């Protein structure tokens, strides 16, 4: 939180002018209610007197009062317009300045700052918190000021027309204030009604639905739905008392409102029988002051909004005002004119800003000569993009030096540094633009001639020029409408048009084939003239095109020198060379286990929308018992009415408590059902559904933790909202039509123009809502683009282009907001001012009626108030609502998530259950290419089989079908060109659950939930209790009890999320057990033990051959120390079995 006078610091002279004039006409919108009263006082006295003596002088006097009314209504037309308009405009300027400068400093801010933050958070922030601040500074403040204005105006205008009554009433005033403040905090705080309690269960509905492999691999889809319950329950356990609290508080709040009207009516009915005041005069005081403190009550949601703002703007303004050390946009430093590619890395030390505990550079010695190449190569995935992101200063080796031409890398300007170097990124890193405009991102000023020179200067012609309109055919998001060779190679041309002085490669041509290499390695090594190139190689094809060979070893460089002189040196490369809708009826049937709650709740609601016609008939009587004569019996009736008010006080205590508590617990019921139903039927799918982007981890979790609550709303909150607003305008329209229909008609005419201001002040999107969602997404697409793939933007130093596109797309939300402000100021002002013109025309027509015989003032003041305030009440109730038609989309989503039938339905008994699964597979010509990555073949012709009790192992390149065959035997997917059958019998006929009982797996990446370790390791067999000694037998078996006996909490400590409260060596041998519980048959230790030191591991294959007998084994591991106990041998060659 930052304080009232810093959240406004982005205001220009004309802003302060809009705010100041919007504030003085806020204050002058305010005092418009009291003066309406003052004339209401004098017209009440005129009516009661004149009709009491029996005269069209009444009509001409009511005329003059109609002018005072209309005049004040036009005054409020103008002052409401100016209030809302200028306040929204001042927020528009301030918020686009905040937005532009936010983006500017979200790019200027470092990269490690994106080790800290994830980009879903950041895009929420940039589209959610900015609209929080827009709410805060936008218009909340103008209506807050108009509230406090009319408060003081009622105060001051009671005093000036009676001071006793004003004192007795200003006495209770805190009561009506705090009361309307709670009645108006409730009908908002419902919609959200969430702090951080659900999170106790959401933690597991998220972490254990993002680790959905280990949760399918082991049948454990009940030890993750049960626990989900046993936290939803313990959330219910407090949600109950808190619904009790909220509804007792609203019951009280109306008990105090009605006690207040009773006190005030007694007192101010004694002062009017000793003739001190008058009917009108007494009204003026109470009504001015009551609506004063009611309108100060009902601005508790606005005083909440302003603080939501202040608390968002704290974190936005602090993101902005940081000056990250390595300043992209800075001019600090020197820039030379003659630069050579003599690069050196000496005693550098870069520890990560997130995970500083994995040290990967521990004192280097790397030297290069101007022009000639190098060779930075090593084992698979050994952290070498480090070198590709430490020179362009994305990060900083803290205690070292990156020497370029006798200088350190820091005293160079960064905007000039990252300009003289260009790279080819390991995975082709495209910006979502056409080819030509993909390339201009290299230098921003590159014309046709150089485009062609640099696109053919590496043979990048045919595969681009085949498809038409080459430079308007767009290429795909994340690499979606182009291939692995048509896309990758282009990353040489762009980062060439830069005309570099050094160029770099992170395995530029890993997925570039032989003839592709024979047409690229020319541009690759004809590149050098006097400039360096830093090679990170994968193959052994052109590493020989070098004079230097620098190896990777324990974070310390070891080998260097020429090829022949080093063939005797015994280095490291020495080894390398050898949605459908769903009706109302269906969302209502979703919970028919509560007919009683909806019945009691809805009859309560019908007995709360009827308090308004109650008031209407009550002070229809009051205007008749306060006539002339009989002053002795006039004090009797007013005491009966003090009483009546008290009794409805207590009734509505009980009616409001019931209504609330009833629909609150029915909502909670429906919510817990929907949550657990969705989560069950969301562990019941294949993994051909949980890899997509329509179904992320946070997408699913969003649907759980938000669409449940919203369908909860839309089921029966609408039932109430309709029952009230039927018994409230319905009953009032009915009564009004019984008593006087002519004036009722004239007021129905206006009802739509009065019940709009209440919904506008907290709607502000009517012909704009979907519009806002559209224009802001279409302008933030660039935000998202440059915000996700940001190593490249910040690596090309091609961010100012993205910034300026951002700006010129913001120019759309800006004229949107301007026409928004102006048409919404107009609708708000005309609704408001039509209230006063309502008083005027209604009472003029009324006085005509009265002097015609067609009515009687007691009835004109029944009708007027019944209808006008059924209207304002419809406003207040409607504008306090959860957006039914929003959560009907939640309804449709949830339903479609229920019904889907996964062809790998794990929750089915249909199938064949053999008894002794002999540890045999039978793979007759199996093939499978990814379903969504539809074409890249990971398995293009294979055939295997293991024998019962034998061992085998597969070794090769990065991911060449080592794992993607496991997803075929675990039967996540059904292979399309092939036929899987186990033990000689075919799979698809097998029961799928049984199938995942005999089959054991362990993980190259073993992961554990947020639980103790009584359960965590027992997981491996649900459908039977896992004993205690079973867990410890495994612990000695898995060779983890050699270290288990250290934990102060031996077997019951609370471990974190998916390898958090563990180490890199520990978990390598923990998942051993979580499948060794079922006593499976087929072991798949896919590098399950890789980070265990040599001292602790090899013993793993001792308790796993004196027991491994009686069952088979498959292996995927790069451990030459154990590969050599094979029986059958099958090898990768181009993803084929030779």
């Amino acid at each position, epitope marked *: 939180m930052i304080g009232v006078l810093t959240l406004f610091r982005y205001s220009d002279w004309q802003d302060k002018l809009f705010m100041s004039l919007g504030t003085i006409m806020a204050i002058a919108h305010g005092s418009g209610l009291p003066l309406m009263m003052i004339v209401f006082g004098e017209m009440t006295d005129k009516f009661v007197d004149t009709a009491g003596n029996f005269g069209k002088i009444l009509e001409e006097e009511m005329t003059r009062y109609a002018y005072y009314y209309s005049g004040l209504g036009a005054g409020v037309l103008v002052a409401a317009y100016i209030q809302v308009s200028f306040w929204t405009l001042a927020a528009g300027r301030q918020i686009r300045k905040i937005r532009q400068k936010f983006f500017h400093a979200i790019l200027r801010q470092e990269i490690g700052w994106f080790d800290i933050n994830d980009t879903t958070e950041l895009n929420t922030r940039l589209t959610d918190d900015i609209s929080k601040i827009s709410e805060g500074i936008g218009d909340k403040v103008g209506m807050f000021f108009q509230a406090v204005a009319t408060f003081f105006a009622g105060f001051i205008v009671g005093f000036i027309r009676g001071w006793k009554l004003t004192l007795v009433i200003m006495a209770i005033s805190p009561i009506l204030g705090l009361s309307a403040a709670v009645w108006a905090k409730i009908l908002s705080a419902f919609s959200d009604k969430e702090l951080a309690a659900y999170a106790k269960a959401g933690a597991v509905a998220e972490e254990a639905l993002g680790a959905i492999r280990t949760v399918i691999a082991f049948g454990g889809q009940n030890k993750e739905l049960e626990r989900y319950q046993k936290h939803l329950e313990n959330a219910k356990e407090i949600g109950i008392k808190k619904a009790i609290s909220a509804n007792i508080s609203m019951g009280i709040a109306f008990l105090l409102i009605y006690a207040s009207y009773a006190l005030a009516f007694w007192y101010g009915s004694t002062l009017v029988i000793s003739k001190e005041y008058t009917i009108g005069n007494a009204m003026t005081v109470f009504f001015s002051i009551l609506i004063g403190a009611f309108s100060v009550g009902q601005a508790a949601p606005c005083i909440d909004a302003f603080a939501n703002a202040r608390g968002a703007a704290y974190v936005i303004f602090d993101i902005i005002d940081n000056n990250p050390k390595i300043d992209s946009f800075s001019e600090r430093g020197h820039k030379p*004119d003659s630069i050579k590619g003599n690069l050196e890395f000496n005693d550098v030390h870069f520890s990560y800003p997130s995970r500083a505990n994995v040290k990967i550079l521990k004192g280097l010695n790397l030297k290069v000569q101007s022009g000639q190449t190098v060779a930075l190569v090593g084992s698979s995935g050994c952290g070498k993009s480090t070198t590709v992101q430490l020179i362009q200063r994305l990060y900083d080796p803290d205690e070292g030096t990156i020497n370029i031409d006798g200088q350190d890398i820091r005293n160079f300007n960064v905007n000039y540094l990252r*300009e003289i170097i260009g790279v080819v990124s390991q995975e082709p890193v495209l910006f979502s633009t056409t080819i030509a405009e993909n390339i201009c991102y290299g230098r*921003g*000023n590159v*014309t*046709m001639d150089e485009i062609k020179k640099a696109v053919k200067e590496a043979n990048a012609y045919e595969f681009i020029m085949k498809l038409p309109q080459k430079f308007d055919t767009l290429v795909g998001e994340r690499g979606a409408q182009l291939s692995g060779g048509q896309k990758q190679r282009i990353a040489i041309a762009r980062a060439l048009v830069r*005309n570099p002085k050094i160029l770099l490669l992170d395995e530029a041509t890993s997925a570039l084939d032989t003839e592709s290499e024979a047409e690229v390695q020319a541009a690759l090594d004809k590149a050098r003239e006097g400039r360096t190139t830093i090679v990170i190689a994968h193959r052994l094809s052109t590493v020989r095109n070098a004079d230097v060979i620098a190896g990777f070893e324990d974070g310390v460089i070891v080998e260097q020198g020429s090829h022949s002189e080093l063939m005797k040196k015994e280095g490291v490369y020495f080894k390398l060379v050898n949605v459908p809708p769903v009706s109302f009826l269906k969302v209502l049937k979703l919970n028919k286990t509560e007919w009683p709650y909806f019945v009691v709740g809805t009859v309560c609601a019908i007995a709360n929308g009827g308090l308004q016609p109650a008031f209407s008939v009550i002070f229809s009587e009051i205007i008749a018992i306060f006539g002339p004569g009989d002053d002795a019996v006039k004090q009797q009736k007013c005491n009966i009415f003090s009483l009546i008010f008290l009794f409805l006080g207590i009734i509505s205590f009980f009616t409001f408590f019931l209504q609330g508590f009833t629909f609150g617990k029915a909502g909670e019921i429906l919510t817990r059902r929907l949550r657990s139903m969705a989560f069950k039927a969301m562990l019941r799918q294949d993994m051909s559904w949980f890899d997509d982007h329509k179904n992320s981890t946070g997408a699913l979790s969003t649907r759980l933790a938000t669409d449940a609550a919203q369908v909860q709303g839309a089921t029966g909150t609408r039932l109430a909202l309709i029952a009230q607003n039927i018994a409230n305008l319905g009953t009032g329209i009915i009564i009004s039509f019984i008593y006087g229909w002519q004036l009722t008609l004239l007021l129905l005419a206006v009802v739509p123009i009065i019940a709009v201001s209440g919904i506008v002040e907290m709607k502000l999107l009517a012909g704009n809502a979907k519009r806002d969602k559209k224009e802001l997404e279409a302008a933030g697409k660039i935000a998202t683009e440059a915000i996700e793939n940001i190593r490249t933007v910040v690596s090309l130093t091609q961010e*100012r282009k993205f910034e*300026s596109m951002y700006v010129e797309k913001l120019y759309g939300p800006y004229r949107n907001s301007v026409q928004k402000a102006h048409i919404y100021g107009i609708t708000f002002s005309i609704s408001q001012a039509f209230m006063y013109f309502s008083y005027a025309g209604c009472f003029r027509f009324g006085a005509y009626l009265i002097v015609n015989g067609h009515m009687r003032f007691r009835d004109v003041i029944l009708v007027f108030s019944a209808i006008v305030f059924g209207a304002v009440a419809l406003g207040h109730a409607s504008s306090f609502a959860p957006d039914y038609a929003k959560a009907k989309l939640s309804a449709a989503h949830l339903f479609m998530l229920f019904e889907r039938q996964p062809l790998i339905d794990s929750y089915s008994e249909e199938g064949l259950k053999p008894d002794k699964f002999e540890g045999n597979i039978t793979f007759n010509e199996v093939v499978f290419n990814y379903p969504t990555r539809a074409n890249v073949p990971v398995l293009q012709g294979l055939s295997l089989e293991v024998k019962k009790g034998q061992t085998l192992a597969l070794v090769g390149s990065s991911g060449c079908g080592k794992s993607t065959v496991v997803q075929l035997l675990e039967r996540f997917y059904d292979p399309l060109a092939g036929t899987v059958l186990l033990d000689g019998q075919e799979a698809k006929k097998l029961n799928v659950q049984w199938l995942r009982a005999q089959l054991g797996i362990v993980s190259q990446e073993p992961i554990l939930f947020d639980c103790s370790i009584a359960e965590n390791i027992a997981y491996g067999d649900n459908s039977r209790v896992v004993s205690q000694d079973e867990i410890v037998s495994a612990a000695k078996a898995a060779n983890i009890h050699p270290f288990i006996e250290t934990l102060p909490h031996k077997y019951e400590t609370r471990v974190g999320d998916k390898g958090t409260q563990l180490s890199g060596g520990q978990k390598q041998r923990i998942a051993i057990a979580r499948a060794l519980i079922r006593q499976p048959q087929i072991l798949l230790l896919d590098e399950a033990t890789s980070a265990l030191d040599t001292e602790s591991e090899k013993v793993v294959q001792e308790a796993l051959d004196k027991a491994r007998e009686g069952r088979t084994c498959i292996v995927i591991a790069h451990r030459l120390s154990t590969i050599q106990n094979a029986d059958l041998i099958v090898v990768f060659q181009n993803g084929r079995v030779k």
Partner: antibody
Framework: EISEVQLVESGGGLVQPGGSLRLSCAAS????????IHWVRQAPGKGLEWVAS????????SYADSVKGRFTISADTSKNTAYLQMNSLRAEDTAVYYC????????????????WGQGTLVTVSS | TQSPSSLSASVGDRVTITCRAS??????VAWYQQKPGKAPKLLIY???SLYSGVPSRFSGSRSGTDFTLTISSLQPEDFATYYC?????????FGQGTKVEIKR
């Protein structure tokens, strides 16, 4: 401007010892925040004489000594048309006015003047 | 200004036009070719590099603060005038150049 030049004819007219015009450099085809519009004076029988240098993306100006003081260059990134007011016209002020583009987001080109404009002759006679 | 070495003479020489800077400034210069009555074009930038679409008989280099264009072996295809603009200062001046032709 990506494959062409979009600088259009700008402020065409004549001047006598009693005249003055509002010359423009009516660019197009790019975003004024990527450039810094310039002007030069090219008087008959003499070499090129630069006059002004405005960088709209900082609202800056590095003035000369010839038209010093008496001029003002004021670029309008909204309407995509800069404006130099040819006021205080003497006789020496006559020239073909090359006004052009100047890429500011690539440091290697430290002299700008990527392109060059054909010029709308200021013609001061009597 | 520069030292104009205006040359239009017998064929078969490497006419190398030079440019001296108005003050001691780094290699921020540009050499334009003008056909008197038209709009110039750039041929080298940063005093060493090469611009687009120009024919690559043009070349140059830098030593201290002295800059050169070169046209070698005077061909039947030489007629123009030159300008030389020095930069890397808030002030950006120019040069007068030469008037190259052939024949007679």
């Amino acid at each position: 401007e990506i494959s062409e030049v979009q600088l259009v004819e700008s402020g065409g007219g004549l001047v006598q010892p009693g005249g003055s015009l509002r010359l423009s450099c009516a660019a197009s085809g790019f975003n004024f925040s990527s450039s810094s519009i310039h002007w030069v004076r090219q008087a008959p029988g003499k070499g090129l004489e630069w006059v002004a240098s405005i960088s709209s993306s900082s609202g800056s100006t590095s003035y000369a000594d010839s038209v010093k003081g008496r001029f003002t260059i004021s670029a309008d990134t909204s309407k995509n048309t800069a404006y130099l007011q040819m006021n205080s016209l003497r006789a020496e002020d006559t020239a073909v006015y090359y006004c052009a583009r100047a890429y500011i987001w690539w440091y290697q080109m430290r002299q700008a003047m990527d392109y060059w404009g054909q010029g709308t002759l200021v013609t001061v006679s009597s | 200004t520069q030292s104009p070495s205006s040359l239009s003479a017998s064929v078969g020489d490497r006419v190398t036009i030079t440019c001296r800077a108005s003050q001691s400034v780094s290699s921020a210069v540009a050499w334009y070719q003008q056909k008197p009555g038209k709009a110039p074009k750039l041929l080298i930038y940063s005093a060493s590099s090469l611009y687009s679409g120009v024919p690559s008989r043009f070349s140059g280099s830098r030593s201290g603060t002295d800059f050169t264009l070169t046209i070698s072996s005077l061909q039947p295809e030489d007629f123009a005038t030159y300008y030389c603009q020095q930069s890397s200062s808030s002030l950006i001046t120019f040069g007068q150049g030469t008037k190259v032709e052939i024949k007679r």
